[PDB]
From a paper:
[name], a Type [name] restriction endonuclease, recognizes and cleaves the seven base pair sequence 5′-CCTCAGC-3′, generating 3-base, 5′-overhangs. [name] is composed of two protein subunits, each containing one catalytic site. Either site can be inactivated by mutation resulting in enzyme variants that nick DNA in a strand-specific manner. Earlier mutagenesis of these residues confirmed their catalytic nature and demonstrated that the site in the R1 subunit cleaves the bottom strand of the target site, while the site in the R2 subunit cleaves the top strand.
Subsequently, crystals of the [name] enzyme were grown at near-neutral pH. The crystals corresponded to space group P32, with four subunits (i.e. a single enzymatic tetramer) in the asymmetric unit. The crystals diffracted to only 3.8 Å resolution; nevertheless, they produced an obvious molecular replacement solution using the previously determined structure of the R2 homodimer as a search model. In the resulting maps, electron density corresponding to two additional protein chains was clearly present, and this was used to build models of two additional R1 subunits. In the resulting hetero-tetramer, the two R2 subunits occupy the same positions and orientations as they do in the R2 homodimer. The pronounced concave surface present between the two R2 subunits is also present between the two R1 subunits. These surfaces pack against one another at a ∼45° angle in the tetramer, forming an X-shaped dimer of dimers. In the hetero-tetramer, two deep grooves are present on opposite sides of the molecule, each formed by residues from one R1 subunit, and one R2 subunit. Within each groove, the catalytic site residues of one subunit are exposed on one side, and those of the other subunit are exposed diagonally across on the other side. These paired sites occur ∼25 Å apart in opposing orientations, appropriately positioned to cleave double stranded DNA to produce a 3-base, 5′-overhang. Out of the entire calculated buried interfacial surface area and corresponding free energy of association for the tetramer (5094 Å2; –37 kcal/mol), a substantial contribution is made by the R2–R2 interface (1838 Å2; –32 kcal/mol), whereas all other interfaces in the tetramer contribute ∼600–900 Å2 that are predicted to add a few extra kcal/mol of association energy.
Numbering used by the authors:
A (entry chain C), D (entry chain D): 6 to 282
B (entry chain A), C (entry chain B): 6 to 264
Write the structure that this text describes.
């Protein structure tokens, strides 16, 4: 049961490197709001429906305090520390699964989810002696999974070892999602399902900025719209930004846990059942 | 159109045959099918419970057991993936609940360009638009297409399936190839493969990607059991056919395009 | 159509501007381009030797060096991937040798179905047919398409390219995504990516699959060199632009469909 | 410099298991024709243009003697031993490359050319402890390449090792090629180029049985039609079956050797050159 602290680390990084930001952080109480949020999140230790809603409330409080400062008073923040808020939130929510799942999960944070291996030999002698190979992986905002160590030895016997991460759930977190970002995901999804067919893949957005006509839902498991609002509303008459929806975080928590709770690949279970996944 | 691919096959075999026709009448084939067809007809929509799906499967085996023996006796030759190899690619061909439409058991695969000349390209450029004959297709709906005044009539599919007696490794590879093409044309579409018995020649496990499910109707470990003339006899299990509601569920889902 | 995407951009900037227009006249921009455009015009078809390709590149750098400084001074804002980022997506736009035709710098990506209602599906079903705006496209040729009396004007491409100043890892991934779609629509087609300088942020090597070539016009190891305000200055090397005959060769090959 | 003897082994297999065939082999001198061919092939030791033509002549002689027996007198022969003739012929032609290439190539015969690796975890504990993975490979009629040993260890430290073959050239051999077999290849090609992008892939046919309109040549490197004849000619007036064309075998030999003779993957050679492959 550990935490990586994605957002907090980046707040720590920024306060040494960017003295504009460092000054603004302390001046407007970014640090205090964060510490409140961090410790308030660590306080909720059971995982019934109600408990999760309490966790969501802590997230909403933090964003209300901190995001208006980022938007109006900093340049290098929108895609530098803002998106890591959701990333760290999910670190908290899933920090207590080892007990439930009944084994030590090493990966519950952003990491690179394995997609494929392919062989690119420099020359003929190379191919035969020990060929160079390449591992493609996608950066994901939040991965639950295990690590392994891939290895190739050629005719010349000296090994090539790469540290890879084979995911159970991969989650993308955006402030608002538009179609060129969805299409990024749509292409990931194909590749990720091929790498780990029983990997679950979610897209987590607060706002939707999608192109009218029917979006393909194809191959992405679920797409979350946590604030139930269109992005065009943000500048419209009588706008009030909705809170991140605790029922959908709860849905996600349940679907994850259900995914973790099942039997995934089983040749004999295919027979008797019929169906693979 | 009321497509019984198999009964149309009977219409055709009886008409062209004569010797096959005398065989049908003496072997009670049309009758045997009618007995089977009527027992399923008893199973209606209200009767599409778990109990009814099993009752239908029992009747199916009665028929297929009698069908097989006529081909597998001394009567005689052209009786392979023609007759028996088209009994299972029909079943609950028509639903009731959603029942949007479909667009038949074939689907428009894709298109390529193949013009002879520069002048011909301006006049009307040659294309080659594919469509394979799959076992059974259920579609969402609907079109035709025109390309430089060349019109071709479009099927857009929700589900596709082959039905085979047995699956080996090298066939499974080619089946994988078919599915890649399918998914390219029609993103959302499910592809199923349905077989009775499984003959995985290497024990090595099989290609997950792009095949959206494979089903074993007999749940039978190896085909060889059945092939080997012996005590070993398979069973068409109703529970296996019951869990092919995945198709129905998916089809229904696409009708209701909302939030 | 004589498409200069960049000179049309000049036509448009001068027309809408006024302040930008006074800047063009004083900065010698149209003139500077005309000087450049005329020097290339000296390089004809007989002159498409190794020597001529280098002479053209020398003139190109003269112009692009003068173009950059006008945007990169105090004159002023909307001057990004608009003006500067459309000088290299033209060049040898017209051949001579084969010169079949083409079909512009955009290509028809693919199609999906999106109907509101059952009645609407029968009436005329809604589709969504894609076409991205790529930097430069050369096509084989030619069509239009009609779907239920909905007509859309078809480009079938031989080559496609983007031109960028610098390539990082995460952009390369999305560029890979674009190419998968492209190859699905048009099997044979080559996809190139062309950039001046390379910024591989992780040293980890890059995605071979579906990108049919990437070219470095500067052969420059890192963008940071150029970005870092310092002694370090890149060179647009003619030899790099000379080896983009791969495109011409492929296009020509498809014309002659024989044995 | 070894040989596997694809066809000869299958002749040896058949003469113990099928007493109809065993009787026919000895009766009609299949064994003798083969031994003539085997030893006559081993005799040609230089690899200039002329030498290769001599090798091709030996192949043509053998098929003339043996194939009429197979067609008229045996049932289990057409796809049981006939296609292995071309497979063994290429074993001979390439049996003398170790000297030229300057290192020991382990694979010069039919084998399974690696396509992909993917992770299929049985459950969550499994994924974390040591996940099960799957290697897809295509049977090819003739592969030149090296072998390697792929390895995965999980949290529980105990390794999973699979013997894989990473190809330089993969070759398919058919008597006559029709489109459903080509489409099999067209799909292999995509996957093989992805596994080993600098793998060369050829289709070797004697006769062409292709569907009129323009075939896609896309992604298969070269397609060989060694007898320069359509399959429909085989039953037509005044038909004489042409010999396998030594100029095309020579083309193949040269293109292979050229492929083996080059530099394949090089990051610094990309820079200076511009182009990857």
């Amino acid at each position: 049961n550990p935490l990586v602290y994605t957002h907090g680390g980046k707040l720590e990084r920024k306060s040494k490197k960017d003295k504009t930001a460092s000054k603004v952080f302390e001046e407007f109480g970014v640090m205090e709001a964060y510490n409140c949020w961090k410790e308030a999140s660590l306080c909720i230790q059971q995982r019934d429906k109600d408990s999760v809603l309490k966790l969501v409330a802590a997230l909403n409080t933090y964003k209300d305090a901190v995001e208006p400062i980022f938007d109006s008073r900093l340049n290098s923040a929108q895609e530098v520390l803002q998106p890591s808020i959701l990333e760290e939130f999910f670190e908290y929510l899933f920090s207590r699964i080892d007990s439930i799942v009944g084994v030590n999960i090493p990966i519950r944070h952003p990491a690179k989810g394995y997609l494929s291996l392919s062989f690119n030999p420099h020359n003929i002698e190379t191919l035969i002696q020990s060929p160079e190979y390449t591992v493609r992986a996608k950066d994901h905002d939040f991965i639950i999974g295990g690590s392994a160590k891939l290895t190739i030895q050629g005719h010349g016997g000296e090994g090539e070892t790469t540290n890879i991460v084979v995911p159970a759930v991969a989650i993308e977190c955006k402030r608002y999602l538009e179609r060129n970002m969805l299409d990024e995901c749509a292409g990931t999804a194909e590749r990720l399902k091929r790498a780990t067919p029983y990997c679950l893949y979610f897209v987590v957005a607060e706002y939707l900025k999608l192109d009218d006509g029917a979006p393909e839902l194809t191959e992405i498991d679920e797409i979350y719209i946590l604030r139930h609002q269109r992005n065009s509303e943000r500048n419209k008459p009588g706008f009030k930004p909705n809170p991140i929806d605790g029922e959908l975080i709860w849905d996600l928590y349940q679907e994850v846990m259900n995914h973790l709770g099942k039997i995934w690949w089983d040749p004999n279970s295919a027979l008797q059942r019929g169906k693979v996944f | 159109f009321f497509i019984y691919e198999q009964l149309s096959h009977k219409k055709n075999l009886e008409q062209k045959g004569k010797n096959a026709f005398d065989e049908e009448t003496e072997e009670l084939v049309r009758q045997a099918k009618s007995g089977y067809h009527a027992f399923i007809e008893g199973i209606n929509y209200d009767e599409v419970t778990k109990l009814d799906l099993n009752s239908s499967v029992a009747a199916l085996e009665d028929y297929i057991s009698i069908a097989k023996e006529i081909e597998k006796k001394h009567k005689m030759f052209n009786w392979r993936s023609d007759y028996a190899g088209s009994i299972i690619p029909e079943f609950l061909y028509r639903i009731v609940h959603v029942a949007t439409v479909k667009a038949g058991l074939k689907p428009i695969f894709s298109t390529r360009n193949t013009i002879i000349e520069i002048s011909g390209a301006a006049h009307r450029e040659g294309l080659q638009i594919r469509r394979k004959n799959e076992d059974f297709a259920l579609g969402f709906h609907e079109v035709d297409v025109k390309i430089a005044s060349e019109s071709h009539r479009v099927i857009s599919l929700a589900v596709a399936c082959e039905v085979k007696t047995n699956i080996d490794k090298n066939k499974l590879n080619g089946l994988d190839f078919s599915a890649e093409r399918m998914k390219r044309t029609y993103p959302g579409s499910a592809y199923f493969l349905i077989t009775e018995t499984l003959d995985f020649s290497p024990d090595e496990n099989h290609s997950s990607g792009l095949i959206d499910e494979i089903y074993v109707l007999r749940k039978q470990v190896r085909t060889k059991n059945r092939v080997q003339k012996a005590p070993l006899c398979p069973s068409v299990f109703a529970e296996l056919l019951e869990d092919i509601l995945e198709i129905s569920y998916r089809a229904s889902n696409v009708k209701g395009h909302v939030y």
